[PDB]
Amino acid sequence: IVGGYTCGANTVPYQVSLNSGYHFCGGSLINSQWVVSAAHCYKSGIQVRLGEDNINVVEGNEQFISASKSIVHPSYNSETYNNDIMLIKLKSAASLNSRVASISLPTSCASAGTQCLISGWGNTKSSGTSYPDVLKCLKAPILSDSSCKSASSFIITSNMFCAGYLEGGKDACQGDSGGPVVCSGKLQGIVSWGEGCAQKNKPGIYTKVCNYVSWIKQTIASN
Template sequence: MSRSWLVCLLAIMACLLASTHGLPLQENPLQEDEKSGGRIVGGYATDIAQVPYQISLRYKGITTPQNAYRHRCGGSIIAEDKILTAAHCIIGTVPSQYKVVAGTNYQTGSDGVITNVKEIIMHEEYFSEFAYNNDIAILVVDPPLPLNNFTIQTIKMATEQPLEGAVSKISGWGTTSPGGTSSNQLLAVDVPIVSNDVCDKDYENFGDETYRITASMLCAGKRGVGGADACQGDSGGPLVVRDVLQGVVSWGNSCALATHPGVYANVAYLRSWIDAKLAQL
């Protein structure tokens, strides 16, 4: 099987799996009557100055070049020309299908700074052995983003695991309920870190045996309570603890369930891969 056919097959499989278990690959279109004051599940409206590392990754289909770019996923600025996002956001696509928008509070319009994606570097072992394993990717953008330490700023990446119970902040333009409409206004939500051992037990009977919590993953959520979580359209975006990027929004069982925390790519665990790729660039 050729590499191109393999990539296409992986993309199709990822889409099918995401539609039933994980956060979907496609963006959720903003409905005409949606108000900007909506809330991410259990969260609150925020300002880009509070999360200046956040970007909107906008996409259009390769067969529909006449269409406008639309919000697909989030991402985090790790250098003036590098973005960290989720592998499931970009698998089976090419750089010309994307624009990165930084310094904006909104997922629509042309405010903020817009730049091009020049190169996509996806983890070679994404989805290996377990679903959404190693769900990480680096985007190289050109021209570089004009960092201003106010609305466009890099974020430090974790080198150590966050403590269980530490409060994390997740931000993005995702849906405000499972399968609902997305928010035009940037939103954030605060949830505690859940240990991988506990999280793995929560997912023990979810889906099939490939849906387990691995070392490349990190969990956060209000167990036994629910009501606060990232949701569809937040994929690829940041999970931050004390101004350090600890996670990348990856997958989960629906959104904000009391029984299943959200699952994130574990930046500290994946840091060696990230650093090796950055060094090559």
């Protein structure tokens, strides 16, 4: 997260860190035993870390649980990032509490102009590199598709939306991928891609979760 702020410990209790010896992506807890993240985060050896603030210090509120199964969307296209979404089932149910909490899936989609909260432990610099150890947060509005496409020349699908600030300075970044975009109390986006971070006319691209709620619900029900 670039141009954001320190969330404050466990203030985003649905935020997870995916760890394969180190933090490599974010994710969102959607019930006690399932996390949703981005397909492009897919790898073997995933341990889900819940209740994290400082990802380099055991602070007392963590739960580490290994993934038992990962399910990349059937239609994930790594070339275009279309359908950039993945479900991870935990080996055991997390014990839910105020610092480890699920976030509601949307029943309807969000619209241009709505403010969202984006969070993660990704890069905080627009040029160069600095990785924070505590969770960072950013408030950003959903942009209209046409305004985003016109400004950025990005090639995006109806399964994606743009959020952020065309002037630059505030954006998600490398290492935030897979993490939550929450708008009006619902998980509407997953940090998916962009070009650089926080550059003028290059806003963040986010997987449009509302297009996948049928798939998420049926998949969890069957597994």
